Design a protein around this ligand. Structure first.
Ligand SMILES: [Mn+2]
Ligand SMILES: [Mn+2]
Ligand SMILES: [Mn+2]
Ligand SMILES: [Mn+2]
Ligand SMILES: [Mn+2]
Ligand SMILES: [Mn+2]
Ligand SMILES: [Mn+2]
Ligand SMILES: [Mn+2]
Ligand SMILES: [Mn+2]
Ligand SMILES: [Mn+2]
Ligand SMILES: [Mn+2]
Ligand SMILES: [Mn+2]
Lengths: 190, 190, 190, 190, 190, 190
């Protein structure tokens, strides 16, 4: 009923998205950026979407292009699946406590495209989350949310009330958006 | 079931309110103050009330008396429609993102009359919203919420987390109260 | 289905807790600390638990030991009643307006044990609430929440946005936790 | 071997102390000030003394006189039991973590009488610990340590590194002194 | 006598711990995070434990999950090996000088779960220790200590008095905890 | 078993040191600088060393050269007596209360040469301790500790937590080092 398939081929990347708004958390993400995969898995899961993401990009340069192209594609998919946006709750919000971190997200699905990202500690402008593969620079967090809000054409406010650990700060934000989205897309019985 | 009709004749104004708490957003507002009409329409709509407001007042002087008398009348109507307040959720809250603005409202319907209004930028103390008719002075926003809370006999906290545009700041607040009220008046299945 | 009985005998105190998560607000609390009884009644009631607390302790010394032992016991009971935590909403939050005070609580029931307590005015570090019996020192508020979060093994963030009266500040917090818990333990239809 | 019995009759109070330095924590304290009893129990226990304190005083006025007279008597007993102070470790110290509080104590048993008390938060100058009986004013903490150090004729430095709860701050200090004393009085194998 | 074996399978990781409190420093650690291995080796060695750690996790994402799961598992093992905690010294502390760095740790093994981590320079919130494999982000230091304290159910205060080098600051802390633990678990001859 | 004899002839001075780590406090010091003799006596005594120091130097110029040469020689002797440093506790620390002063010392005997000297009041940079003979300038305190740490090849941190009297500040430091050393050199039963 509320599905969307988006293919997006740029010079930097090639993306395929499959999105079902009324899913059960069946999520499979592979972008070549493992921490981004982890975040998009959290997104899909906590939003109760069925989400398949397959992305290959110029990760030798860095993750930026891949992360950004995926977010654009994902936003487009979200907007398409929403459709005319009839009979939905439209507004959604969520607080996410994650150990010492507390994040919050609020959405208006019919509201004009906008993104406000506030509260994130300053050290996230130059923090890296690194494993055995392509690393993740937390400075991209802003971009990811902006890109999604811009391409889904929704109002999205994301706040970090407080927090220390960059893994927790980042993950809390993704989960906050997921749960705000979940509430907003749900059918309204009025 | 939960209806109320209030007639209020003062020297300054004459007001009629018709309110159904369990409505479908059938709203008709005419106070002679067009921007106030726009706000009360947003209120009724987003609260899912059926609301009819008819008000005539000394708008040649200014909107103050009309806006205040309507708010008193509306609060009285809300309180009457609520009745004994049995088996309702009682507590409600809502975040409303409106472009750059984010507003929040929280209510306790059984709690003693109280109103706290915080966060509104200082320039709203001397901002006017003006069209082709009677203008609206944003300084009245406080009064409107206080008057309603006082006459409905409810606890009402309204916060502007941030914002710039006075139309957005004002509209977000009215919508926030509407959606907080909607949640609070809903029947509780416990 | 989701019940728990905890008996806890220390040198300082002897505690019995009976907890049903899926109750109707049938609450009976007797700790020998009347204001604590009032708070635990608010907790049980607003969480829609069925809660029986019976506690005797060394109240001649002060309430601390009794209040702390009860909170540990209560946390243990909450954790046990939750069980495997299958098919619940997991996340919950609540704003509680109480006259001039506004408090907020947010929980993650599956999240690792953690407690953050912020915003409480400084005078609550040396405020006493006193009647005709054992008094209550508001400095214990922190401890109570920490103890519960530690023994239920949950993430619990409690904030006072603003407030003046210590009775209101304390009561709002207890009610906020109750309603956050209520939302989190509720079955999720997904 | 290292025992002492002190009887001290003033106008304000009547005190009996029985002290064995080489005990097993057999402690019985009754001063008419329940929280002081709790602290002196912690002292005796954690020092591994055998300690019997019996005190009656003008508690209708307040605890001050009783608390001070006991501390003087106890210091005298400690000094007498120590004797010539031959073949002991002489120096002792202890850190005591108590939830959020961390306290420290350091002693020189042969060093000239001296007491330094630092780090205690300012609100302890006007904090009361109150149960169902005679209350305890944390401002006396200083006095108790000074009185003991003066009458045992020892160097005693007590520091609160950090802490919030007055019960914890007070109890940590008493336990810190106990364990510093324990180490100092122990026989030195050199 | 005081042994424990813990197996912990999560989605992120799989952990096996073998712990003997009364060991001779026979330590074998393999988590896939070499610097963490180095730290856990220092822990086991300086505590005079016999410790075997085997952990595999999603290190492609980053070390966080593995480091955290190991710490939880290790804390659980420590608590189990401690048992009823009868006839032990209970309190322990240690200063560790490491070149320019000085760190300190203090424990109460019977005290309620708590962790305070103070003094660490600000640049450790965004410092990485990197070799030829999975890197280590010093921001996790806090988490590791908190996780252990939470799962062993002990009071643990860790302080950096001063220091510059992040390798030294981190290593000193791990060694400080090890030696505080060693002293606390030792049998008390009273 | 753990002895050392060091002879050191410079242009400025001629030094003989005899050191037994496992002594009974048999100490005889003569450097021509009486206050230094007093300090080195405190060192040897409180460390439970057997120590003989005989030094003659250009004291007509000032004590500096003699004090420094002795400290170098003494450090060399300490290092030699320690030997391979097998089966010792290695780490040691001590707080020393001396009237109003509190000093602290912490050592790592196997740790790389290092000395940190902190907390000493500023007036000790230009304070003199003078009797009927060669005076002592407290500014040398730093040098003495640095010289020892450098020539014994040990980590040595010395702190003055607080203090006023320069005799007490100086003496407390020497005693603190002595007792830290005593604990570190002691055989470890593991
Ligand atoms: Mn970009
Ligand atoms: Mn007015
Ligand atoms: Mn508008
Ligand atoms: Mn206590
Ligand atoms: Mn406590
Ligand atoms: Mn009340
Ligand atoms: Mn006095
Ligand atoms: Mn994660
Ligand atoms: Mn974590
Ligand atoms: Mn190393
Ligand atoms: Mn020199
Ligand atoms: Mn002297």
């Amino acid at each position: 009923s509320r599905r969307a398939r988006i293919e997006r081929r740029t010079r930097e990347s090639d993306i395929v998205i499959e999105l079902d708004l009324d899913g059960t958390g069946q999520v499979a993400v592979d972008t070549g950026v493992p921490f981004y995969d982890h975040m998009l898995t959290a997104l899909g899961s906590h939003a109760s979407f069925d989400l398949t993401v397959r992305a290959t990009g110029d990760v030798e340069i860095e993750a930026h292009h891949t992360i950004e192209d995926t977010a654009i594609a994902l936003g487009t998919a979200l907007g398409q699946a929403l459709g005319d946006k009839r009979g939905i709750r439209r507004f959604g919000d969520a607080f996410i406590p994650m150990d010492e971190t507390l994040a919050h997200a609020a959405v208006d699905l019919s509201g004009r495209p906008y993104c406000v990202h506030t509260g994130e500690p300053d050290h996230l402008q130059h923090t890296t989350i690194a494993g055995s593969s392509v690393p993740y620079h937390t400075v991209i967090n802003r971009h990811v949310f902006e890109s999604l809000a811009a391409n889904a054409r929704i109002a999205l406010h994301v706040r970090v009330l407080y927090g220390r650990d960059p893994h927790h700060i980042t993950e809390a934000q993704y989960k906050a958006v997921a749960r705000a989205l979940r509430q907003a897309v749900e059918p309204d019985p009025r």
